[PDB]
From a paper:
Different AAF variants are expressed by different EAEC strains, where they are required for the bacterium's adherence to small and large intestinal mucosa. In the fiber, subunits are linked together by donor strand complementation (DSC) with an N-terminal Gd donor strand segment of one subunit inserted into the hydrophobic cleft of a neighboring subunit.
The donor sequences derived from the corresponding major subunits form classical donor strands (Gd), each inserting five donor residues into the subunit core structure. As such sequences are only available in tip subunits of major subunit polymers, the AAF minor subunits are likely to be tip localized. Furthermore, the significant sequence identity with the AfaD tip invasin (>60%),which has been visualized as a tip subunit, together with the ability of AggB to functionally complement AfaD mutants are also suggestive of a similar localization for AAF minor sununits. In minor subunits, strand A is not split between the β sheets, but locates entirely in the sheet 1. A conserved disulfide bond also stabilizes the minor subunits. Interestingly, AggBdsA also bound to fibronectin but with significantly lower affinity (∼100 µM).
Numbering used by the authors:
A (entry chain C): 1 to 8, 11 to 56, 60 to 119, 125 to 142
B (entry chain E): 1 to 6, 12 to 17, 19 to 43, 49 to 56, 59 to 119, 121, 123, 125 to 142
C (entry chain B): 1 to 11, 13 to 55, 60 to 68, 70 to 120, 127 to 142
D (entry chain D): 1 to 8, 10 to 56, 60 to 119, 126 to 142
E (entry chain A): 1 to 8, 10, 12 to 56, 60 to 120, 125 to 142
F (entry chain H): 1 to 6, 8, 10 to 19, 21 to 32, 34 to 40, 42 to 58, 60 to 76, 78 to 79, ...
G (entry chain G): 1 to 8, 11 to 43, 47 to 55, 60 to 104, 106 to 120, 127 to 142
H (entry chain F): 1 to 7, 10, 12 to 16, 20 to 44, 46 to 56, 59 to 79, 81 to 120, 127 to 142
The structure:
Amino acid sequence: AEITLISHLGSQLRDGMKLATGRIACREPHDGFHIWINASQNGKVGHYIVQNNRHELKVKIGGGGWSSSLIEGQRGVYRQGEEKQAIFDIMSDGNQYSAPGEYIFSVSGECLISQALERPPIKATETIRLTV
Amino acid sequence: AEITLIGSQLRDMKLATGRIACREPHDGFHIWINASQHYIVQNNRKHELKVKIGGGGWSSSLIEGQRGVYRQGEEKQAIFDIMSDGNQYSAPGEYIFSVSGECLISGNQALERPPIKATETIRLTV
Amino acid sequence: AEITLISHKTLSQLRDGMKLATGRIACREPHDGFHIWINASQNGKVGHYIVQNNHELKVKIGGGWSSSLIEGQRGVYRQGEEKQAIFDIMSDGNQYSAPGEYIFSVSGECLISRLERPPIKATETIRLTV
Amino acid sequence: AEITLISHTLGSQLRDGMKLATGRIACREPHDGFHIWINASQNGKVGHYIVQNNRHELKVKIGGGGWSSSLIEGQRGVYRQGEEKQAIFDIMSDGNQYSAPGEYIFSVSGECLISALERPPIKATETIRLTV
Amino acid sequence: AEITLISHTGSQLRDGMKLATGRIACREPHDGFHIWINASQNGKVGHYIVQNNRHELKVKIGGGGWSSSLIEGQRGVYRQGEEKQAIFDIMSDGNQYSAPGEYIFSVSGECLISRQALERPPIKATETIRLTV
Amino acid sequence: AEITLIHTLGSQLRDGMLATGRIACREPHGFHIWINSQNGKVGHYIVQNNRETHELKVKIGGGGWSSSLIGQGVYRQGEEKQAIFDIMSDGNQYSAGEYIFSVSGECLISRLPPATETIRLTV
Amino acid sequence: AEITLISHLGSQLRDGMKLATGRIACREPHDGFHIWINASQVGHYIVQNNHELKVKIGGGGWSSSLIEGQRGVYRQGEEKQAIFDIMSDGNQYSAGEYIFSVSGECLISRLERPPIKATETIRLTV
Amino acid sequence: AEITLISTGSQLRKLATGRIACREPHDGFHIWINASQNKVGHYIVQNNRKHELKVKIGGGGWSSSLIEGQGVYRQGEEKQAIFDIMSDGNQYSAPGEYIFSVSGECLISRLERPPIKATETIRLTV
């Protein structure tokens, strides 16, 4: 429901290298989070390809306590919890030597609600400028 | 549509294993446990045994409808586990719960629930 | 020992807790906890400060962060062996903001279990522009 | 900090001190006293004004107890003691007058004063349509 | 006894946010004010849920200087005072999302009378206002 | 129908403060309580000394207590047995003495009944 | 210098559900208060049954602190007295007795710790 | 804007050494100790928990300064500058704790003080 993204990069990206950190925060009570990147999926759920702003970069989203998900019917990564905020990373997906410059894309996410469990009516979206 | 299923401390490992098979053309699989919610299965005859289902060719899923885990796929069979959710101890008595599952159909990657649902039982011998 | 700050835009009425800036403290070498502060005038409670325009702004730092003195250094603290921690610079109480810019200098360290302050300290600057 | 103005169609016959509109000023921050005024040409004493129709004139004053006229450097207005969070005020007919029907549109500004004592960096300002 | 309502227009609402603001005027002598919304209660008097025309806003009424009340035995919020008028708001009851559409707030109120020992008067006012989201 | 009460302080006192009260309603039943001095904020009070007619600003509740009129205080909904509460200072002030509070309370029932205790404090 | 403790029902535990309520009193002039629970731990704890429990301390005007190098919750004031709570945090269940050890100092601003330290024990009967 | 401070005998005649760094372009450095004055750059430090010890700051790459009412300064656009906090002459020191702090700013040609100053504290037994 509220998403903050912090940018950090250099061309040599090792696998699982942290490219950007993110935080999703929820103001109303909730059970669980899910997030995703608004880009073409590149293989497994949560892995993606993003274009240079004038060259490509393979990223993935998540980190500890996140794992891939399909939630009516939004593909992303999911983490359980009722806490107010959760941390996540955007990581390099594989070793890659990337062309310098800006890779701009957005991230979305929701604070899931409940006995049923449900997507809230509003999703957050924030844009990040990833600089290589 | 077709499911076959197979100490006092544990963290992390197996408790039962299983396969869901889907004879007809389909797009994915979809399974869960029928118990309170990752689940908590109530003792028979006060303590709470924590379990989870899947195995990570499986993904956390909410379809309609139903929470549980899923896997995209046109193949016939898919294997899964029933594990223990984190470190825990075990009180005596029996533990009884069940596993359901369905062969998902794509309308058109848009996974949807089919008419038939399989359910199998576990009376978990301690 | 590595800090990245971003600022939030918008707009004259700040509500208590409102996020002015967000930061990431990263520790690459193994460690036991984080430790951050603002280089700015103290204002009552430990993680609370006063920053000037060019009108002044009352702010606080943190968010699972605890007020702390470590070897006499005031700041906020969190236990953690994880690689990174996120923090905010927030409005302390309701107040207004004169248009203009407020410079926040933030410092931080990766504490080590044997608590001890390291010999290396990060320091970064972000400007809140109103 | 926050001003709301609600107007009582008033009719052309305006008796002295007749309520034409009701206002509220609300302060978040801790504060010592309130401070309000109309952005129009002063007309005699402090807190007394003339407003022109949106094509004749209307004579109004602001306050109504315990509001008192004030110069708070260097802003002329009317003023109220306290640390309470809102205070209510009136806009009144200043003297008996017979007024041409229609709209008299003007703004009202004000500040929460802070404790020793001084003005805050910004004032509030709201617009009222007085309908005769 | 006399009530005037103004409405304030995204999709979200923070706790305490003003959806509408109102005045209750009392010409005749009185020792208090007494208001409520005519809608399904929801928890504390006077907190309510309001239907969209098709979606539920939880709203609350009163604000600074209004205490929840139960007078003969009308539930609402109240305020002592002999002054001629009083300002109140209709506020978002917690953080929530707003389905678009129309919401009708129907507000009633009364100029309380004494014989400190407050009593309901013979006059009640009711006014309608439509919130647009 | 059951209240228990309890507190030095020294002259100095800010806002926010023991106090302490505690009303017990264990028969099938709401909770409101009050101090037995009208001062414009229900339920905020003023209590005179035992020398002449000094005085003190005071309020009751503290947490899940809202101001209310029910022709009587502050109040909390819930069906539990006890209803813990405090009484604090209404304003930071000086105070050169003994001030005594009558505290009352009731148990509110159904679809909206026929307890008074006294406490004293010292500064 | 001095701490005094008081217990309190049911077996279900939600959030902020008080469990005890103590009071701390430094006679000598001093700038503040400073208290914790002695249990393997933020100011939130786990206190075993003689299974477990999860618990928090402070409430009111109390905030998490770390003061050279004692983790607690603290507050300021020359006020010769201060009052606090030990309470639940979020939904949970509870199977007898629980003993909390509770300590506390009075701080100085010279904010530092004195040689004198209080410790009191209190029982949680459920 | 950025300083590193390296900082417990009854007798003495270097209590700490430190550097101030200035990453953004600037034209000089300005530092001082927070404590009662004694020349300018010379200070008298009291001990809470009576007596006092005379300290002085800099090291003669440093000149006595008063900039907008406030220590010692040094011209230069390089990124760093080193300084010492040394005992002001031979003196005796009774038991107790000696607390004080050092601050510095990066001066700009356009000289005058920037909005940012960094501070570091020293505390001493003997």
